[PDB]
Amino acid sequence: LVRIPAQANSNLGSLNYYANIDKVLTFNRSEQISEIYKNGYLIYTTKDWITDGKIADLFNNAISQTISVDQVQDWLTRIADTDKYGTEPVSMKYKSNP
Amino acid sequence: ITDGKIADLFNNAISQTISVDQVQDWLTRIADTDKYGTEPVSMKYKSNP
Amino acid sequence: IESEWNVNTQYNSNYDLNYDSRIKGFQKGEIYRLGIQFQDNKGKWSEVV
Amino acid sequence: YNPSTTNAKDFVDGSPSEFLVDENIVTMHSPDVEFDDRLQNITNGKFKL
Amino acid sequence: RYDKNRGQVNNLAVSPTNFNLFNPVYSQKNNFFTFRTIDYERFSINYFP
Amino acid sequence: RIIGTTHLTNTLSDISVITSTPTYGNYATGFYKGKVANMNISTSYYGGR
Amino acid sequence: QLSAGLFWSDNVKFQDPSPQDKLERLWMVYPWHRNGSLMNMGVPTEGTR
Incomplete structure (x- = not known):
């Protein structure tokens, strides 16, 4: 732990600093940011299956060829609610040098 | 939890609190074994000189 | 004036090892047997009075 | 957040696992700190940037 | 106290x-330079013929 | 003999919870860590807590 | 840098399961990824993910 001293012209107190983080991140689900996040964070996949084995090109254009699982209009009823919203934690762990 | 405001609910634990049995909506939906605790408590600690 | 310590922090350890050994004091209710020495022109300390 | 609408706790509860960058507080990475062990023990050093 | 689990x-x-x-x-x-009282009327010789 | 008092101002507290089995709810949050007493010396009103 | 990308390729977990299909989607993989299946899945009804 490193307590960064108080910074002038600021009513805040002394700041504390960690660079060795051992954290678990949990997503609380609510609808004060968007109505859909009451079920969980969306899972993002491709707009279409692999066409003719051109996986490399599809990987390169991940910005465009991408869409969430729920928004796939063909999968509106073929996927259960538990297999289209992710509500599991994330393990955040790393260390730093001097 | 109303709208994800878990922090505010945690802060006001003095007021927003009630025993399981006294919940008038749960008078018949919970078994007697899941509303009364009858298990021991493990108390263990040490002290310095 | 110890400017290192302020009330704008969670914890400030009053560290007195950066100074000399004159940080020592005297307990308020204690009895101390006192004395006084004298130095010659050479630096030789006399006995205690 | 707008203070007239929501509190700080309520606003953060919408995404408490969200991170923000901070260029106001930085981390200088010099070779001397890693290699010279004398710079790894600095405590509240008065220097200018 | 030489451990870093402080504050x-x-x-x-x-x-x-x-x-x-500790x-x-x-x-x-x-302790290095320590002195003591000396009796005036006690006869300790100082002559070595 | 009691000679004085101690000016408590803050308290540094922490909590950790580990469960052998998973949560009951398949989508439950589980252990939630709230804000308790981790305040500066300036907020001395809430001392000894 | 290499932050996120489509580093996974698996079939889809349909309500009517069909792992026998040789078709493949690609799934996004983040640095701090979900503590579960890389592809769309969660809370299995029979065992492990």
């Missing part, structure tokens, strides 16, 4: 093995 909010794994390790050497007096 930290965590204090979860502290113990007598980690929290209050280096006695710093609690040293002015």
Whole structure:
């Protein structure tokens, strides 16, 4: 732990600093940011299956060829609610040098 | 939890609190074994000189 | 004036090892047997009075 | 957040696992700190940037 | 006290093995140069013919 | 003989919870860590807590 | 840098399961990824993910 001293012209107190983080991140689900996040964070996949084995090109254009699982209009009823919203934690762990 | 405001609910634990049995909506939906605790408590600690 | 310590922090350890050994004091209710020495022109300390 | 609408706790509860960058507080990475062990023990050093 | 588990909010794994390790050497007096009283009328010789 | 008092101002507290089995709710949050007493010396009103 | 990308390729977990299909989607993989299946799945009804 490193307590960064108080910074002038600021009513805040002394700041504390960690660079060795051992954290678990949990997503609380609510609808004060968007109505859909009451079920969980969306899972993002491709707009279409692999066409003719051109996986490399599809990987390169991940910005465009991408869409969430729920928004796939063909999968509106073929996927259960538990297999289209992710509500599991994330393990955040790393260390730093001097 | 109303709208994800878990922090505010945690802060006001003095007021927003009630025993399981006294919940008038749960008078018949919970078994007697899941509303009364009858298990021991493990108390263990040490002290310095 | 110890400017290192302020009330704008969670914890400030009053560290007195950066100074000399004159940080020592005297307990308020204690009895101390006192004395006084004298130095010659050479630096030789006399006995205690 | 707008203070007239929501509190700080309520606003953060919408995404408490969200991170923000901070260029106001930085981390200088010099070779001397890693290699010279004398710079790894600095405590509240008065220097200018 | 030469351990670094001082003034930290965590204090979860502290113990007598980690929290209050101590280096006695710093609690040293002015033992090297010590003096004592001398009796005036006592006869201790100072002549060596 | 009682000679004085101690000016408590803050308290550094922490909590950790580990469960052998998973949560009951398949989508439950589980252990939630709230804000308790981790305040500066300036907020001395809430001392000894 | 290499932050996120379509580093996974698996079939889809349909309500009517068809792992026998040789078709493949690609799934996004983040640095700090979900503590579960890389592809769309969660809370299995029979065992492990």
